[model samples]
Target chain A: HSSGLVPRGSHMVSCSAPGKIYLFGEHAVVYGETAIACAVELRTRVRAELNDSITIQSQIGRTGLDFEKHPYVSAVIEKMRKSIPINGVFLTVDSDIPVGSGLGSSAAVTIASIGALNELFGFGLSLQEIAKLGHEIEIKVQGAASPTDTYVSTFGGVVTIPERRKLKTPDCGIVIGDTGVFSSTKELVANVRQLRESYPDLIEPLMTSIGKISRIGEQLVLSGDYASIGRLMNVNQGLLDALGVNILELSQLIYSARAAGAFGAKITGAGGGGCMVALTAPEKCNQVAEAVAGAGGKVTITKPTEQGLKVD
Target chain B: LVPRGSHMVSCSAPGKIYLFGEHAVVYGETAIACAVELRTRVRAELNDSITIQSQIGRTGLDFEKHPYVSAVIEKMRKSIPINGVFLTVDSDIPVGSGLGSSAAVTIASIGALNELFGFGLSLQEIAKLGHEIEIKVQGAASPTDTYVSTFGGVVTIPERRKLKTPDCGIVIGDTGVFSSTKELVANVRQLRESYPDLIEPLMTSIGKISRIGEQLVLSGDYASIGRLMNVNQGLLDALGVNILELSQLIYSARAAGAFGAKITGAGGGGCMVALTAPEKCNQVAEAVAGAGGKVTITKPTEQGLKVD
Candidate 1:
């Protein structure tokens, strides 16, 4: 249902959504297993301005609703247009999240663009509706996708996949270390799939263990037992390594983060060569970030966010 | 049994590094171990009274200091009436470094005694007896070390297939942090007991690595072998056998361009092994040394227990 609150001429709408990190479980989630994802302080803000023609602009460049240059944003615009009318607008996107870093940057931008368009057109889409549409958009863009990223980017807290239960956001510092090495998520996922196929008896249980980590991790998150949570994160990292997704660079960052007094550290994404995440006390974020940087990682200091998409 | 000959007999056996599995093999999982160039030599000769001599000093069948040799002597005496004999032991492998030093020494001792006293034990029998001595001495032992030291080359356990030895440089980094295998194995057992659903599969994954690694070893794909070794190290880390010093050594080796590097034995503390091109051995060795590990550069050997 439309809210019927469309702005007058020359009005602008800005909406931002947060990115996410997997506290536990990533590839295992692909197997319909449990995973805990938390939205980070990093956000992708999409600003929609009433314009003469449909256009999109980001760090990558500006385009006239070109799917090639801005697939996620373009899909969001094209998908939402069928539900609303008079879609002539200029969408400018700004993000603090790193693209292709397995930090849910694409999901963040997608959800933010939808929120912006929903706000500008008074589409009155609920948060659940936005998340649902975001997942749909991702599947269209990437051919396949998981709801963990889109859901967390929309809800902005610790949420379990498959179960879709929201737990109390951990009040801890989050530091990410990017290896600056681009890894294709599709290829990494394929490698894990092949590994599982080659040894179904072996790899299946490893995935099951990873899911078990998330199940146990859910309780730790609710109890605010970050220490134990971090410990399990380390364990999860080991299984990820076994899955053949980890690289020497990621291990360097992960071990460096752990040495710097992070509660626990592990690969944050598909992990052939991307970012690793460390959970720590709010005060120790800087120390962990520095250590990761010293180990040749591009470091970012951030924390879990509670705010999701909203008009500003 | 009487001495078959008055001539002295010397036998040497190579030590081993776990290329794929270590602690997992304890649970009947597969493991691939490679015999390294490091060896222990035992020399036997007819004597007026039973005497055991080594760097530790001379003693009369002292089980306290030379338990493996003593056990071998005590057990072999059951099959043959050896009135007296002299045994001297020397080794290049570091003791308690998880390099299979004990296994090497035991196998070499058994070979020397078998040759001197004419025990008529076959090579398989020697390996079997070595495993028995290890179990008798340590109270529990995996057949991997003794079997690898006996058969040499790249041997897969629970299957015992002897694959071609990889022609790569082997570098070992000893952390100098003494770790008891008993304690480490016990810790893993407790961990498995606490989370059977989790740890058991992890062990199975390691066994699978060994299964896959067996082919890599056969095809001489040292690079892929190295990669799998790193994965195995990660699983071992998950099992809580890894320590900071061990990680330092392992990462140092990998960063230096080793084909792969991982904890070699029961982790927590001890040694890590790195596989590399023959020419790059020195660089990997230097890196491990710089990382505060006692480094040793060696290579795989096809010779297991042999007369020298």
Candidate 2:
């Protein structure tokens, strides 16, 4: 793939993308829970005019380094401004993710673009360092976030975190399904927290089990048990249910969705709007994709990307 | 102190397995193994101390002492330290059968300890134990031997027992037994002493074959799996374990309802096995037996060793 890109020995520099999550941890992690998120393959591609003043242009508008204006982005910019001269730096964020759905769409584009520019212009930021920067960027956006979406969207594919309590960058996979609506991750988080207090006696164990299940589910994929991943989706939705994330129509859809082969389909963002994620079996992808439509929802199959940063 | 005794059993059958990655290992390669008609026994006993007396009593095993003599003696002298024994050692599955002589002993010992020692171990544990036994001699053995011996079917050991992340298990089709243990082991060693890398990726291939075999068994998708067995055995041959005579027999077996057949043991000589439809075991065994070799019927040792 690097064969014909910008000429092998050219002075060109390139930057690639890190995609976002379909299901941000939302209420699950706040109450010590776990949720599945992965890198969206479509990255924010940035080719730096290296050694030139850094400017910002993004396919996803909110992603400009002018981040200082957005309360969420200001901190990240302030931190970066401390190191680099502000005016000449330009970053273009191109992404296909729905922002504010807890997908970390904007945060992801930032991570990918940073990685691309670093290599392209000889910035030389290691993935870990770039990710740390992305972490700070994510904190600015979501205030207090799991950073899973940011980390994963920045570096694609199953990133597994050995243990949850450590606040570590977990190893996860890209499991996505459109809930058919653009839901708000923040609002749903609040309502779910409300339900958690109301149903602590009922929902705790189920969530814990799902957390463990997702842990194993991620491991299984890494191990190549591709055919069986759908089962994990069932558990994911059940946990979403405890958080009061499921509606009557969505609940029935969840059941029939498996028949459609959408391994996982639950409201993704917050409480409102309708988008869910599905882990499609490679063989049954088409069949289940139709099933997602029948379930009266949109389903998008996405892959986790690992190109945290690249440039042309 | 509390002392307890448990019921145990032993079943052994002759295998007709072929060592595809013969002369491999030692160099970090893999080997393909298939079950054969040669005899394998799982002796579930009511003894203590994980006692194991393998084909040691059987003839043609003296040479076997060369590689493992020291370790086996040392461990045995220390202490049997086991409880109610269930020993499953494959004897008719001879040394140099290219089949898995060393594996037979390793698994037999582990099976004895597993059944007698109360470990309730997993396959990964057993496979590691097998490699631990192998590390000294062959530098390493694909944990596949440990896998087949434990499951009493066929499987591939992609990585060394200790160095792997355990994936889903596979149980390949039941090709009827053809070759004997002695021939298979000899052939494997002959290959091992020469080209160890011959075994790399061989285990993973076998693993895939075994898994497909399982799908066939459950769904009675014999025709497809039978063809798969032939394909799998061919991979074994590519690793250079196939002998002209065994190849002929394999082809003959296939013509006679054997889904697949391969020279199991040491391959120079000894029994072989064929994966056939359930009812075809007798016929397949008969055909192979008719082809100037001994034959037998066997099954997967699914219930490792339960206690009473």
Candidate 3:
């Protein structure tokens, strides 16, 4: 299914960026809630050479994630996972995706390699099938992971995922903004569990609201109503604020984005700090992104895509 | 362009203290209150044709939808006792300021209507209805605003909405600052639930705080009362509702030798009313006016501020 020549000894291991999510409803989404998400043009590139060793590198912080230098990385690998042998190849992982920003960088990398392995082995697995494998693998790294990241990366285009769905990513264009707050998404999942215990009934209704908005968002994306998409993202942020998930900076950014004519805005990741997405016309999106950048954010103007892998 | 009725009646409704009805007030728990001088008013007149004129712009609330008022108007119309549209509203009340300006206006307007129509609702009934509307408009608010504004001066509102209009026998005037009643209302709404769990234990604290000032008032110990007012201000700070600017004003007012001063209602903002010693009340009043606040020297209304 791929055209690029396989690098010498590079047959399997790979890294790539998962599409960015605006986290329009991120905080609420964590409470067993739902949110609108989409893929982005920015990404990670990976090439697997058949060698006996594994290597991981990224554009952002080099050591903290998947590094041999970190004890946690080795411990997790040594204790939890099987180092599946695949024709003895050096799997060097790399990416251009923003890290420590709340995009699905890790999942994109982990899942893409799985795709690479199947490609090299000539297993010929469908993306839907790969997604199940991705979910299982990612859950090990990200507890309670949403299927959206894997589903979107494996397949392309806006995907709509519902809680009751077996295979789908909710088709939602969330014009996201990065509040530039450093977010540890893994830990955010843990906090949501705590909040659920604190408020039982509140979480589900919010999730229902997410579903409603997600449906609205899907229609908006199809209609090219990114400004409304931007506004909806901000609305999701308000819901998050009600649940007390957003910090002062994230809340301020949502307010600023609204003031700057963004339809909606919210922290994309678990917050503290993460990428933000906003939906807008392609041209006005840059204006919204710049506004975010001015407010201590690292912003990017990107749209939704599905299953884009390293080809060149 | 005048209001609907046989005769035009414009009675002002005063604002009050929203001590317990704030954000922290858990649902089903009642808050306490007392009215001050801030008020809303209504004017009605007869007309050949029915017409309503209101300046309530963009609040997202429809005015022609009240059942009781509409029923009353219909009854008046059928009896040929009234023939014009009634103007009902507090156009002067700023939306978010904590000042119960809307509550005052609503009560004042309701009272005026009942009087104009000879609806003959008791004063207590007028206050109660006003309290109901205030709670409806605002998520949670103590009945103090309606009760005090209806009757004038300090009145006690218990848990069941029963108003015990107390002649606390204390009359305090404004501290001269246009403190935001809206901010106070919002902050109070936020912190409302926390007070109930806190109010009972704090009752002794409030009692202790009230005693010093009470004794000062009873014994005509104006100096001590002024000092106790400062002490009460400190107690309010301990409750976590007092803000720096408000506390500073309390301190400033006392420094200028007023008999007593502190935030009149919820302290985040809203007017502060201070009880200056009788003889020195003038000096206190002058100090407050000079400091950019309004003061109304209120006399004891024996029948209280009457409604129908």
Candidate 4:
């Protein structure tokens, strides 16, 4: 993506976006709660070049707008096509964020695609326009998703959902305990809706509590209180637990991180079998990382990234 | 009781039943807990040396073997240094039967000592101390047990609203199986941790059942309360806390025409409680016994902790 070679009049373009992790307010965000989300060092890169017909290429193989393997990008390509009239373009995707692991892989791909197509066809989409475009693409692909993933991936740094305010990223080590389990965001969201239908009185108050955690979390995030934020994260995880989105694999990693002295550990995203994240002191990062690995989780120790999406 | 000369003080506290809320309450949800008739009695007397005697035998602060008694003594000794006292414990509350037996004994012992030393501890103080002791021993103990045992009667925790204890037949069917409250609670916690979102609604479902039952509980509606108990038991059953034995006993009581039946305590393995009319108590007890459980037929106790 850093290839600086631009032959004169070359129609080649490359765009990349950072993946995000929810520091607080994950499942709660869908209920219109404020959640703090941060872009991470891990990224997804997409490259687009002038071609005959719209074609997409990735490690998963090539597909068109039919989108057998790449749904998010297909939605992005399809959505962007409406804004710009183009004959054909070849798109290539490379991502470090594990797909379906709840690290906002969909949003990353979508944002990366939007940035690439914006530059390639000179659609002149602002970052906000790009973010809005990315969010729309994601909603089209995955039903019932909050804008945290798309907004943070597009704007970078840290953002509070619902409020959509960017804040200073907290100074702390982030250890992602990847269960390496693929959980469908669509199914998990649908399940929650089903549960809500079955017991509105029971499910409603819980959503309220989750939102309360995030509202308190906004102040805690600004204060740079990692310990207090971690506690809220734990509380939020408990509410998620009650919602029945937790799985055994995620918990194994969550416990491993907390047992290793991560300030707090919780299942992230829709949380059927995705990844758990732990916040920790800088010195204890390696220990917690190793603990999560030992407990059969793929470990990714990364800091929050300040930049969001970029064209290179 | 704190006379200049030799003095002895005795007090008793009741075990509790969770009419609603168990795992959900751990997540800051409301639960309604009631003091049962089963009681643990503690007598404290000024003596030459600090001695403790219980059904398990006598010991000098063997915190490992008798955590409840040791924890109470440890916490009390920190606040008020006592010369030397003997504690003799007697209890009808069954240990590890999903009853708050340990909480009852701790509250009773704490209450006895308060009266013996003229500490003049308020009921709230005694409840708080008992809760701390339980937490210290159990690693994590909810205030439900100690609070109910201290305050007596039926009350909602965190809300602290007193509700009428329904007038009905209450039968406790102990599986003769001892489930570690610590292990079961932790297992449920870890289980819930795995699916924080999915379990949230299930817990909310459980919480709603209790909230709805509270109305029935106050209205003296035994049948509706029993129906809610059935719903709660089904939820707990889905939570994977029900063992085959617990299931057998619950179903047996339910089949025997008990109004409602469900597992009590931390689940995994414990006792099943059945709500029925006083007339059907004998039949329900027999059915539970036939299903391989030690049955205890007791009514809800309106009295909480009593100190002399």
- In order, the Cα lDDT scores of the candidates are 0.88, 0.49, 0.51, 0.79
Across A30-104, the per-residue lDDT of candidate 3 in tens digits comes to 445445556666665555554455443434333422433432232323322344434343344565566654477
In candidate 4 the C-alpha lDDT for residue A31 amounts to 64
**Runs in model 4 with CA error above 4 Å?**
A1-12, A63-66, A139-148, A180-184, A194-205, B1-14, B17-31, B34-210, B216-308
**How many residue pairs clash (N, CA or C atoms closer than 3 angstroms) in each of the candidate models, in the order given?**
3, 131, 72, 24
Best by TM-score: 1
Arranged by TM-score with the best first, the candidates are: 1, 4, 3, 2
TM-score for each model: 0.82, 0.43, 0.52, 0.61
**Per-residue lDDT of model 4, residues A149-199, tens digit only:** 788899998887777788878788889987877878879989888766765
Evaluate candidate 4 by giving its C-alpha RMSD to the native, one decimal.
Answer: 11.1
Q: Per-residue lDDT of B114-166 in model 1, one digit per residue for the tens?
A: 99988889999999999999999999887778888998988888788889988
Error of 1 at B281 (Å): 7.6
Name the candidate that leads on DockQ: 1
Per-residue lDDT value at B126 in model 4: 90
DockQ of each: 0.41, 0.01, 0.05, 0.08
For candidate 1, give the lDDT of residue A218: 90
Top-lDDT structure, candidate number: 1
Tens-place lDDT digits, model 1, residues A24-104: 998998786888888899999999987879888889888898889999988988888787874489999999998675788
C-alpha lDDT of candidate 3 relative to the true structure: 0.51
